[PDB]
Amino acid sequence: LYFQGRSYQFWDTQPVPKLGEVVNTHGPVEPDKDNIRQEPYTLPQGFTWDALDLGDRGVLKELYTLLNENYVEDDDNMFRFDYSPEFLLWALRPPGWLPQWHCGVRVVSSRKLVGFISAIPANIHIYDTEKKMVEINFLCVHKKLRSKRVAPVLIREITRRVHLEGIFQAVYTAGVVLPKPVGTCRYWHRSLNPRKLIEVKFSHLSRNMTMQRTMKLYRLPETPKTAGLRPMETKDIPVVHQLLTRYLKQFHLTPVMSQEEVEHWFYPQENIIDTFVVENANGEVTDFLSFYTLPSTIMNHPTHKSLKAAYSFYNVHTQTPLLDLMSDALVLAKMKGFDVFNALDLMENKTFLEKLKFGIGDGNLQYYLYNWKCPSMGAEKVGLVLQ
Ligand SMILES: CCCCCCCCCCCCCC(=O)SCCNC(=O)CCNC(=O)[C@H](O)C(C)(C)COP(=O)(O)OP(=O)(O)OC[C@H]1O[C@@H](n2cnc3c(N)ncnc32)[C@H](O)[C@@H]1OP(=O)(O)O
Ligand SMILES: Cc1nn(C)c(C)c1NS(=O)(=O)c1c(Cl)cc(-c2ccnc(N3CCN(C)CC3)c2)cc1Cl
Ligand SMILES: [Mg+2]
């Protein structure tokens, strides 16, 4: 059985392994290029490239609107991600960000923004190799421009722009199956406000249960249990960096963060990123938990307009049991007004998902490397979370 809906006209031309090729080697698919195309790729007539300065508030709003109206939706068209402008700044301007890697497509005549793709730099540990790579995210084509082969042009153009800076590998996640996943993860969900989630058909009411009984089943403590939990502060930057660096060594695909990157990714910003640390009776920070804020717009519901979701980010345990840490994460999310807590089955997350009453969801998230041939891994060896 060859075809399963995709004969990969674009992807078969790219330096990636074929779907169903078993990989036993480790290394690049093609050599580092010593001459790179200087000219942007040709777009269809009436469209032009534009590098978006997200420090211009109006341009940031334009990107916000493109994504708010055209980024990831569920298959029944009830929910769409609603990344805030300030979130987008957090995700797209980490240390080493470049304006040319905020790659937009605009209509020539009206200047309307109809396409986007982004690269951010990251050091990536893949098995026994550490490479400088980029992370690709926020690939989006306006709904009215769909299936016109614009996505391959966006992909080739960010590839060129990244090659110009001397980087020849990338890491990316998507919901679609492409040549070739290095790992596959599943989304899991922990109800915090089950009433609302049942009302908007995110969850279903179980066979023999009432609304009041489902509320009781998912009821959480009013405050966390772990001794010495508190918000991350500036003084915790070094130890958070140390804890994460050491904790991530056990996995096979991880970021390798500088202290400035740890500051950027974890230092709390209201309604974007939350990090809590465990400072013990000695004064030592031994664990931390983190989650980011990503609501989804709710279409076609009479009462509820926004689904408030917290996403598990990086959780490091050395002295507090992981089960207790995540229990505290759920409590903190509840306290802050989240409707649901989402997590993937990567890292050690399978050790707590069922025990803490997460339900499995519909969506697979595929992890990919560009121009790096290595064996695939189980979800539990994946130690990388992209927003
Ligand atoms: C060294 C540096 C390298 C840097 C680059 C690294 C690689 C980066 C790779 C990008 C990582 C992105 C990370 C994220 O942001 S993942 C999030 C992606 N965004 C969305 O899902 C938002 C909603 N959907 C859309 O806006 C559009 O439908 C998109 C833009 C996704 C496709 O637009 P459209 O629906 O109008 O289609 P087309 O006619 O233009 O093109 C169809 C072709 O594109 C292939 N396709 C479809 N979806 C994806 C996808 N998510 N990754 C890679 N390829 C994808 C498809 O197999 C086909 O190719 P082939 O089957 O013929 O081969
Ligand atoms: C409440 C809700 N809102 N919405 C819009 C949805 C679909 C749900 N249901 S869901 O919670 O179970 C869920 C969730 Cl969050 C996300 C995805 C998904 C799918 C494909 N790509 C991505 N990304 C791509 C790139 N980024 C680095 C990572 C994101 C995410 C699928 C599901 Cl099915
Ligand atoms: Mg298109």
Can you spell out the DSSP letters for 190-242?
A: EESSHHHHHHTTSS---TT--HHHHHHHT---SS--STTEEE--GGGHHHHHH
Ligand 2 in reach of 79 Cβ (< 6 A): yes
> Which of 67, 70, 72 to probe ligand 2 with, by most ligand atoms within 8 A of CB?
72
Resolution given for this structure, in angstroms? 2.0
Q: Which of 119, 142, 151 is nearest to 43 (CA)?
A: 151
Please report where in the chains the tokens 């009776």 appear, as a residue: 281
Q: In whole angstroms, give the CA distance from residue 160 to residue 168.
A: 10
User: Which structural technique was applied?
Assistant: X-ray
Q: Is 292 helix (H, G, I), strand (E, B) or coil?
A: strand
Closest listed ligand to the CA of 139: 1
Contact 315, 326 (CB under 8 A): yes
Domains of the chain: which residue ranges? 1-387
Q: At what angle do helices 237-248 and 259-266 cross, to 10 degrees?
A: 100
DSSP letter (8 states) at residue 379: G
Q: What sections of 39-100 are H helices per DSSP?
A: 57-70, 85-92
Contact 290, 274 (CB under 8 A): yes
Q: Is 104 helix (H, G, I), strand (E, B) or coil?
A: strand
Residues sharing a CB contact under 8 Å with residue 381, sequence separation 6 or more, in sequence order:
183, 251, 252, 253
Give domain 1-387's CATH number out of 3.40.50.720, 3.40.190.80, 3.40.630.170, 3.20.20.140: 3.40.630.170
Contact 268, 231 (CB under 8 A): yes
Contact 297, 79 (CB under 8 A): yes
Residues sharing a CB contact under 8 Å with residue 42, sequence separation 6 or more, in sequence order:
153
Q: In whole angstroms, give the CA distance from residue 32 to residue 38.
A: 16
Q: Is 128 helix (H, G, I), strand (E, B) or coil?
A: coil
Ligand 2 in reach of 178 Cβ (< 6 A): no
Give me 329's structure tokens: 């994460």
